[PDB]
Symmetry: C5
Subunit: 345 residues, 5 copies
């Protein structure tokens, strides 16, 4: 019979009185909007800005009894996105947008379908710049959790209620990678139900668990700083009398410990509180620092003054042979207490 574009103008026009500024079931029960998203892209998790951008589909389903039809034979319709302003749509927004936009390439990326009984499917495509607060206390060994919450804006709880559908509430695209994190397959789903001095506004959220990878920070920041500490211990096996050899090994080890730490401030984030990589790069500075102060003691005792010249030279060898075993044992005690308290947490 008549084409669907003319059939919807009969259904939504000034005939039949469909006003797009009044929600369905007016002065009655609230509207049960159900939602599910589909994540196309995900990433660029900035940590100075503390945000991440995501590229989603947003599928919304509700019921509208004013749009029920029976004369037209086909079981479903589709409104063109040009005529989309003549339909009541929920005023969904994201409570932590921090900037967002649509996509308008070659067509508005907006889909609208109307079933026969009046169920309405509405699917759009959004780029979000969502903000999640991050906790970089233990920086390589951290688990970040970045939420994504969907409030209503104008309609309160008694007029409009969001729901996650019980059939795949969050799907993720297949070949999706990240430069630093991995995305677990555990999506929490819970209500939040914001209160203001304006009213009870509904909101639903979805939590994403992010686990930071490790293999880069071991190879270039832990293991090289580990080897600089090992090169401090070889002063305790070099002779006592070789005075240019000991202190030439001394400061040039604390120089390369500073050079290791100074160049690595570009790759690390720029927060103003102490990390767990920063405790490692500061305690490993102290062992190189304490490995020279040992020799400042040995050089002073051996130079100190025949019977007494043999007694002091035997006491200075005693503090050497103690420090060969006892001081690498101290570093292993730190190395145990470090990795326990940053894998339990």
């Amino acid at each position: 019979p008549m084409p669907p574009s003319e059939f919807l103008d009969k259904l939504m026009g000034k005939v039949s009185g469909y006003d797009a500024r009044i929600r369905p079931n007016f002065k009655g029960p609230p509207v049960n909007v159900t939602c599910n998203i589909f994540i196309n892209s995900f990433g660029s998790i900035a940590e100075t800005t503390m945000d991440y951008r995501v590229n989603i589909f947003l599928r919304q389903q509700w019921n509208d009894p004013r749009l029920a039809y029976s004369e037209y034979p086909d079981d479903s319709l589709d409104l063109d996105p040009s005529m989309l302003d003549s339909i009541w749509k929920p005023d969904l927004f994201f409570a932590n947008e921090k900037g967002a936009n649509f996509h308008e390439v070659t067509t508005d990326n907006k889909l609208l379908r109307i079933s026969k009984n009046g169920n309405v499917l509405y699917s759009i495509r959004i780029t979000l710049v969502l903000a999640c607060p991050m906790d970089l206390k233990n920086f390589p060994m951290d688990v970040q959790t970045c939420i994504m919450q969907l409030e209503s804006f104008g309609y309160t709880m008694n007029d409009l209620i969001f729901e996650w559908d019980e059939k795949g509430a969050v799907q993720v695209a297949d070949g999706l990678t990240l430069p630093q994190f991995i995305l677990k397959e555990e999506k929490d789903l819970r209500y939040c139900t914001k209160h203001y001095n304006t009213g009870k506004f509904t909101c639903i959220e979805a939590r994403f668990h992010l686990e930071r990878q490790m293999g880069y920070y071991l190879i270039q920041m832990y293991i090289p700083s580990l080897l600089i500490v090992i090169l401090s211990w070889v002063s305790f096996w070099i002779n006592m009398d070789a005075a240019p050899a000991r202190v030439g090994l001394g400061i040039t080890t604390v120089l390369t410990m500073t050079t290791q730490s100074s160049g690595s401030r570009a790759s690390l984030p720029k927060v103003s509180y102490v990390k767990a990589i920063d405790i490692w790069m500061a305690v490993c500075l102290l062992f190189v620092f304490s490995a020279l102060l040992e020799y400042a003691a040995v050089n002073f005792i051996a130079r100190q003054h025949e019977e007494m010249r043999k007694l002091f030279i035997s006491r200075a060898k005693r503090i050497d042979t103690v420090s060969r075993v006892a001081f690498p044992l101290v570093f292993l005690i730190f190395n145990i207490f470090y990795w326990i308290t940053y894998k339990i947490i």
Copy 2:
């Protein structure tokens, strides 16, 4: 009875003569607009640009006797954001915007309610890029104060007056963090009342006190530069005669003091005036610098010329044993006078 969207077109149309270009109470008392904000997001406090961005709600309440109604039974209404251009709204703007924008995702994030007596509630959602001038004289030990002021633009003092409401004038969202600062729970509220050659324009402002965290700059910039100064003092306990050991300890300590300072210019801001971290990294350069000039004196006196060869070698040991105690005492006097004058301020 009739739906609220048709009731507002009777109330705002060409019938009843409501013109949206004339403020309420025209040729009479001024309009008492009262305001309060709600901060969703806050951060990215750039210091090269000297600004910070914030994501707020902006609630405005005023009275409009032309919008008073009694026939419609419900105690409140809500205008749809499409029909929002047919209401007088105040021309509020921020005196230090430096760029801003709305959010138009899935609906204009704009709320309008009309009470029965004519009170109007208007709530929108704005991202600001507000500018605050910063004073980095004492850089780690600083308290920044970044204002947020709300002028009127077209209406003068006798027509429109802003007010902070006496019931929660600034609320902040709960789980809100910052990468470098902490946000105190002390919001000042004061008038500013701008004058121009155009007229008296009202404005209200809200001050935010920011306190910079400390723990990163201690662990990687103060304490490592502190340990380099301690490694200068061990030259005074090494023997006088070990000439490659003293100067090999000398310059390699002033090399790692430069290497500590040179790599840290990326994390620091790029202002062109002297900070308090810059005084520390320059005075601690002088103690490493002065620890070698001591040895340049000792090597010259001991080489200088039997009776006189014993007298000079005893004078050069005198200037060593003085400098073992007196020069670390000088550094503690600087270390007292530094931290006093940057914690009193």
Copy 3:
């Protein structure tokens, strides 16, 4: 006769009933849209963001029997881009846009031609910010593959079908360069045919193979780190007794191995998993590290204690003459196993 702009208003107006919201061949066979692109610009392949931008022409051809004409004499027409909203156009979009826009400089860069039988040519100009996931396991020796896929949005498989034309489906502009990659002349063309819970949506894609150039990373990151390992081997030819000469060569070689690696973290990407350049810069750290621990053994055996003073000094020369040949042989075995497993892959 009559001008073509007035002839198209007769063809597309309310006369003849051409509605731009109904696809051609409605309630019949699907529409066979055929496509080919023309790449003007290409590049800025970011790897933190994992995307690349491209500037294309997008030529679309389909058939529309409602636009067939015979009265007007000329064999082709051209609709002005102002009147472009009165033509059914396919809702093509890119499945990995991540932001895109048109160009509207001096005229909308949009072309539309209508042939006599009803074939329609439609050519536009788009800047894309397409996203491709990258795999930086073997970072200098990698072959990246960045796809470009073109879904439909609103119309399912039974209504609209995309095709690559069989005559030059992807052309590339002539003098097109890249800062880091080279673009092979092998463009794959395959279907993808997306499924959702909404329906079967057609999509076609084109793969681009990118091969990273090598010559920068050899000259400044492999060859200089190669020469630092060679400067470790000259300690095995310097005398055993020259104790300041050996360890002064020792740590100052592991200092310049760290200095080589620390400054190169700015040019490298910032992923959080181990690369192939990172294995090279860590194993070459171990050979410089192991070249000093050899001397810590030699200095301890030779100092260890006449008959036994000759036996130990001959054993310490034995471990030197073994390490002159055997340890550069170990490095060549690593140097073989490295370049084999990163050129086979």
Copy 4:
């Protein structure tokens, strides 16, 4: 009587024939538009891009005899910014915009007042990204001058003439700071009067003098590089025979002179011509370079060959005692000629 919004529609409508596309005083004298600006924000003076952004008010005053009224009683009016397109406005633009925009937060930030005799006040709020060419020949000791010029675009000299008003032509906001510069209170005001092949177009400009602060570059780039040169002179007081002590002091001083210069390339701008900080960091490299070549002469003469073994060892001490006094005297002559020629200019 009647409200001012309806009185202006009588004044600007199709009644009385006010056409907004014809300037006042048509086919007569030119229009004397007078202007003054008010700088709210100022800064982010980039030097790679060679631009600076500024946030101004722009007040324009002209006369329009068609807008003169006498029936309405009040002495001034105000047109709403929605109805602003029905007024002739000058086509002022900035000759070095390089991008700019308005502000449209909560209302267009646009003001229009009409006096009784026909004087029109028009005030808007603009963010500019104005471009000024910079001359970094003498980089810390420079005085930058960044202009701000306001051409007309369509109207020539005989139709429209800009003027600075004689009452506060440029005001600046009170608490306005900059990260690197200071803004002098000397605003030049002069005409520029652009010619083209199109016609004489009027323009007025305002010069701003910027003076770069100094205190950061002294503390971290001049004074530390000054101390490295002083540590070269202590080789001339260390003994001649201590051969590892002299060259160990030699290269480790030219290493820390390179380390000082290499890390400072991030803070400096990236121009491709020689600065004044670059002459300092290159000449101070030569004094450390020449302080070792002195010892290469001393070590060769003293090793050169009893009577002649005493003569050469007395000649090598002669070139030492000359270089103790004469070479720090040469550096002071450079230090005089440097600071004179970069403070006169």
Copy 5:
């Protein structure tokens, strides 16, 4: 008589049938559009993105016999930019835009004049982000050529033809500087005449020759790396027996050669192929590398074993006195062959 705005509505209205969608001289000769540009700003030549932005005026002149008038007395008119959509304008675009925009500050920056015979002048103001491929083979000694080409989009060769006018086709603003390049006063002008599978589209282009300045790269990258090579040669004048002095001079010279190269990777571009600065910083690494391997030979021959102890100590002095003259002669041969092949090219 009647004002010009009403005279153009008679000339362009539905009276006289001027349709703005049909080019002048329809079904006849093509339109001879002539063009010339005026460059206001120029710069920010990025090399990672391989583009540059420019701020131009764009003057277009063509003839339109439908706009010829004789009744109105004045010899020229000017259409207001609001009524600008009622004029046929050429669909000029730039073939390498990569993003562009107009300027709409206080008025659309668009000019239109109509002469009496029908010549039309049209001048607009555009910011371009034009893309030019760059060839950084010889990086400091390069001459870049960045084109600027102006295609037609919809009209083919037989309908519209672009021309450069024979009277000043490209003017440049007077005080125009660049941070790294200089702009020669030699503007090439040639046709390009693009072909597609769509048709012959006209295009004209203008080449700009850019010559990179040199003075920064000499003072801080060539001359300092030159002096490090000179400090290698002083080992050949220091005594053979001073074993800590030679290798302490050895590695600390190859450390500062790496430190010179490592810090300079931030200022250099990030291409992935070998430059000419990279050949210099790698060959100058080899001379410092080869200056130590000489001493590894000398220390091994002199230690090798009375008659034979005199013969080897005289052979090791022979290889020293050869290397004092012969090896700085080798570096000058490289220094000749380097600067010849990078100034001929």
